Design a protein around this nucleic acid. Structure first.
Lengths: 135, 76, 57, 188
RNA sequence: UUGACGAUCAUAGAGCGUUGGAACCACCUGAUCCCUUCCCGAACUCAGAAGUGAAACGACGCAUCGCCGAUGGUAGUGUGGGGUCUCCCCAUGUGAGAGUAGGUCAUCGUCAAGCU
RNA sequence: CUCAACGGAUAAAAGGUACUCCGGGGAUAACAGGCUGAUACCGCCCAAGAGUUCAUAUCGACGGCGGUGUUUGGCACCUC
RNA sequence: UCCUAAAGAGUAACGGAGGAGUACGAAGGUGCGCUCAGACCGGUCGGAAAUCGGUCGCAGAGUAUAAAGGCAAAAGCGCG
RNA sequence: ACCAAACCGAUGCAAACUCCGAAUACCCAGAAGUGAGCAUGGGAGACACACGGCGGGUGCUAACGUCCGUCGUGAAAAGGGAAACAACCCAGACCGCCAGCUAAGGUCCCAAAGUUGUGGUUAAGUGGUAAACGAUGUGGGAAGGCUUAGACAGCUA
C-alpha cells in the first residue's frame, strides 16, 4: 500500500496527537472535499478501502486526490511473549488525523453524485467526517 | 543487534553569567568548539576552553561580520 | 497607607513557594489579620497567594 | 453591500473569546494608507450574508464604524478550522490613489460545447482559480471570463492567453512566470 | 574633488543604468640591475613614464531579487478550579511563528588632501 | 596484569543429585482467585457482488464500532 | 558520540542508532604563500566521467580515524 | 505511445531535520518587610517504597503493569465528606466545658438543617452505566422554497 520507499530509520516513538489543523484544512485542488472532524489515526488499509469505494461510484470521469500519506511505522509484539526483550517488528503504517484535515478531494462531477459518494467512503473510515465546498 | 552503551556526560555548559565578578583563572565556558569566541580579555585554551586573565565583569556581546559571539570581560 | 489581609485557606496542602509567601507577610493561622505597609514588594506577594487571602481593604 | 460596526476597546485573549460566546460578535481591524489601524466589532450574523455572496470578495464595501463612513475592501479571512465559521476579519481602507491588491474569481463561461469535448472524448480540468489583480480602485474587476470552448483535445491554457480588461496587470506576469490555467485531456 | 585607517554588520546586499581624470588611482613600458616562478616578470619585485579611464574603482540613479517589518488575531504556557477526562474548557498573568499595510539603493569617526 | 566478571577475591579451580539435608520467602514460579482482552466466542454497521432477472429468501469480499469473561495469553496484588 | 532528557548541570529501561583496545619523527613547531565540490561549453587515441582552458561558484568540498559541535587570523592545501 | 532526472508553481510530514522561537525553571546583583545560613565534632537510622496529578519511554497511547522527571498525600495523621473506601476533596488532635461562628459536603423520611423564592426544560423512572449508527421525540435560533393570480393534501379524467 502507501508507504515510503526507503526510510532513514526503522522504528519510531509514539508521541501524541494534539492541536487542531490550520494547514491542511483548505480545499486546494478539487471543488468538493471530505474533511475530518474528530481526531484519530488511519492505518493505510482503510485508505484503499475508501479509495476503491469512490472510484466505482463515479465510473465515468472525475479526478481524485489523496491528501494524506502514512509515514509512521507502528510495531506489535508477537503472541505468547513476555514483556521486555526489545521492540516488536513493524506491522503496518499510520497517518495521524486531527480536526479540520481534508482527506479526499473530487472535481468534475455533480455535487449530488459526489455527496452520495463520500457517504460510501465515510463508512469505511473510523472518523466523523463532513462535506465542504471550495471558496 | 543489542544496543545499550551510552557515555558518561562530560558536564559541559556556561558558567559565570551576565553580570558576575571574576578573577584570573575562572573558566566561564567549557565549550565544544567555539560556540563563543575569545573576546577582549579572555583566553581560549587547548580544547577551546575560555578563561579569564584580568578582573571585572562578563559581557557576552555579538559583534562584527559573521555575527560571532564574543565573550569579553569589562573592567567595570 | 496600609491594607489588611485575612488568611482564609489552610497552608498544608500547598506548594513550597506559596507557603513562604504567606509566612513572609506574617500570617500564622486561619483568621489571622495583620497590617502590611503597602509597598510594591508586599503587594507582589499578595498576587501569588491571592486565593488563600482576603484583601478586605 | 453594507456593514456597520462598533469600537471594541478591550484587547486580549480573554476579552476576545467572551465576545464570541456571550454576544455573538466577531473582532476586526481597519488599517489603511492614511491613518492608524483601528479595531472593530462586527456580528457573525451579518458577515455571514456577505461571505455567502459571490463577488463580494473583490468588491468595495461601505463600513459604518460609528457614524463614520469609509469605503473598505476585504483582504483576509481567519476562519475556525474545526467547526467552520468566521473569526476576525482584517480589512482595508481604500485610498483614491494607491494601487491595490486583491483576488478575483474566474468563471470558465463557455465550456458546454468544446471541440476537445464534442469531437474527442473530452474532459476539462480547472487547475487554478482565484487569480489575483493589480488595478486602480476606481474601476473594479468583479470577475474574469475565460472561454475554453474553442481549441483542442490536448492543449493547456496559460495565463498569457486570457485577457485582463481595461488595463489591469497580472502579478504572475510581473514575476518571471506564466502559470497554466485549464487543461483538456482524455478520460480514463 | 581623493587616498589611508576605523565605527556598525544587509533597511549597509545583489542586479541594472549612468559617470569620473591628468591631482589621486589603476592599467601601462622594460627587466639591465634587487628579486621571483616544483614552467612562465601571470603572481612576487625593481627602474619608470609616455598611453588610457577601456577594463578596474568610486560616485550618481532604479525596490525588479534579497533583506528588515507593523497592528489585530491565533498557537502554546505559569498558578487556581472544571468537565463528556488517550483531549479540552473557565478565572487570571503572559503571548509567538507564519502571513498583511508598508519599508530600504545606508549612517558615522580620524588624518593627509579637493571650495574646502 | 585480559578472570575484558575491565574499583581487579588466590601464584594457582569443572560437573551431578529422582538418595538428598538445614535456614528463609508469597522480595519469586507451577494449581485456583484478582485486574486486563491482544486472542477468543456472540453481534452489529456500509454492500462490491451471486442468488438465471433481482444486494438484503438465503449468503455477503474490502473495511469499521461493540458485548461476555468461556481459552491461548499479559502482570505478579493474596496463600510456601 | 547522538536520541530518550522536560531551552542551566544531572537523570533509568534485556529502550532506539553507531564506534574504539590505535596511528604519526612528520600527519609536530614556525615563517612564507594559496583556495573547495560541483555545473556547464572548447579541446589528440580516454570519453557518462583522466589531463588542459575557460566562465558560473558563494563550503553544497576537506578534517589520519565513529558521530556530534566547529573552522577566512581559515583548525583545509603547498614549500623552507 | 516509455518513462523519467533537473527546473518553475501550488501542497503535506520527522525523537535521532532547523532560517526561527516563548511561558517557566536557573544564575549574580538591589533594596523594604516578616521568620535558623556556613564550618568543626559526638550519635544514629535509611539505601524492598506505594498511589495520585502534570510531562515522557515501553506496552495494545491495555492493566492497582514496568522504568524515569517534578509537586502532593500515605508510610510516620487522627477528625468531617465520597453508602462501607491508607494514597481523592477538607483540615493538621496539649488537656477540660450539656458554649458560639464556619470549610468541603448538604437541607422530604431513615439522618442534624428549605416539602424556600424565581425563570424555563425532560415522561424516559432519563436522572440512577456505553459505540459506530438509526428515527415525522421535543425546546430554541437564524434560513430559505411556494402561496387567496388558489399553493400543498386530499376526491375527481
Amino acid at each position: 500500500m502507501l508507504q515510503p520507499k526507503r526510510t532513514k530509520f526503522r522504528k519510531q516513538m509514539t508521541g501524541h496527537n494534539r492541536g487542531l489543523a490550520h494547514r491542511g484544512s483548505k480545499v486546494s485542488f478539487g471543488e468538493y472535499a471530505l474533511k475530518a472532524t474528530s481526531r484519530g489515526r488511519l492505518t493505510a488499509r482503510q485508505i484503499e478501502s475508501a479509495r476503491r469505494a469512490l472510484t466505482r461510484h463515479v465510473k465515468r470521469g472525475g479526478k481524485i486526490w489523496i491528501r494524506v500519506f502514512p509515514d509512521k511505522p507502528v510495531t506489535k509484539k508477537p503472541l505468547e511473549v513476555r514483556m521486555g526483550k526489545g521492540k516488536g517488528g513493524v506491522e503496518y503504517w499510520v497517518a495521524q488525523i486531527q480536526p479540520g484535515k481534508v482527506l479526499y478531494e473530487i472535481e468534475g462531477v455533480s455535487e449530488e453524485l459526489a455527496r452520495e459518494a463520500f457517504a460510501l467512503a465515510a463508512a469505511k473510515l473510523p472518523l466523523a467526517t463532513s462535506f465542504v465546498k471550495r471558496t | 543487534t543489542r544496543n545499550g552503551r551510552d557515555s558518561e556526560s562530560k558536564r559541559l555548559g556556561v558558567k559565570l553569567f551576565g553580570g558576575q565578578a571574576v578573577k584570573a583563572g575562572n573558566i566561564l565556558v567549557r565549550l565544544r568548539g567555539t560556540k563563543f569566541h575569545a573576546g577582549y580579555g579572555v583566553g581560549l585554551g587547548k580544547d577551546h576552553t575560555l578563561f579569564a586573565k584580568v578582573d571585572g565583569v562578563v559581557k557576552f556581546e555579538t559583534k562584527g561580520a559573521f555575527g560571532r559571539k564574543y565573550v569579553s570581560i569589562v573592567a567595570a | 497607607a496600609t491594607v489588611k489581609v485575612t488568611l482564609v485557606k489552610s497552608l498544608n496542602g500547598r506548594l513550597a513557594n506559596h507557603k513562604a509567601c504567606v509566612k513572609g507577610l506574617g500570617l500564622r493561622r486561619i483568621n489571622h489579620t495583620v497590617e502590611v505597609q503597602d509597598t510594591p514588594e508586599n503587594r507582589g506577594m499578595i498576587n501569588k497567594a491571592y486565593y488563600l487571602l482576603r484583601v478586605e481593604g | 453591500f453594507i456593514v456597520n460596526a462598533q469600537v471594541r476597546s478591550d484587547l486580549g485573549k480573554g476579552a476576545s473569546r467572551r465576545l464570541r460566546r456571550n454576544a455573538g460578535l466577531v473582532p476586526a481591524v481597519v488599517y489603511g494608507g492614511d491613518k492608524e489601524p483601528q479595531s472593530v466589532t462586527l456580528e457573525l450574523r451579518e458577515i455571514a450574508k456577505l461571505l455567502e455572496n459571490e463577488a463580494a470578495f473583490s468588491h468595495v464595501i461601505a463600513l459604518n464604524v460609528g457614524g463614520v463612513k469609509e469605503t473598505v475592501l476585504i483582504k483576509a479571512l481567519q476562519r475556525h478550522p474545526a467547526k467552520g465559521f468566521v473569526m476576525h476579519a482584517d480589512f482595508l481602507r481604500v485610498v483614491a490613489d494607491h494601487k491595490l491588491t486583491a483576488h478575483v474569481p474566474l468563471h470558465f463561461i463557455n465550456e458546454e460545447v468544446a471541440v476537445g469535448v464534442k469531437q474527442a472524448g473530452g474532459e476539462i480540468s480547472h487547475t487554478i482559480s482565484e487569480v489575483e489583480v493589480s488595478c486602480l480602485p476606481k474601476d473594479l474587476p468583479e470577475f474574469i471570463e475565460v472561454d475554453m470552448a474553442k481549441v483542442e483535445l490536448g492543449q493547456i491554457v496559460h495565463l498569457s492567453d486570457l485577457k485582463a480588461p481595461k488595463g489591469v496587470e497580472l502579478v504572475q506576469l510581473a514575476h518571471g512566470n506564466d502559470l497554466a490555467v485549464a487543461n483538456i485531456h482524455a478520460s480514463r
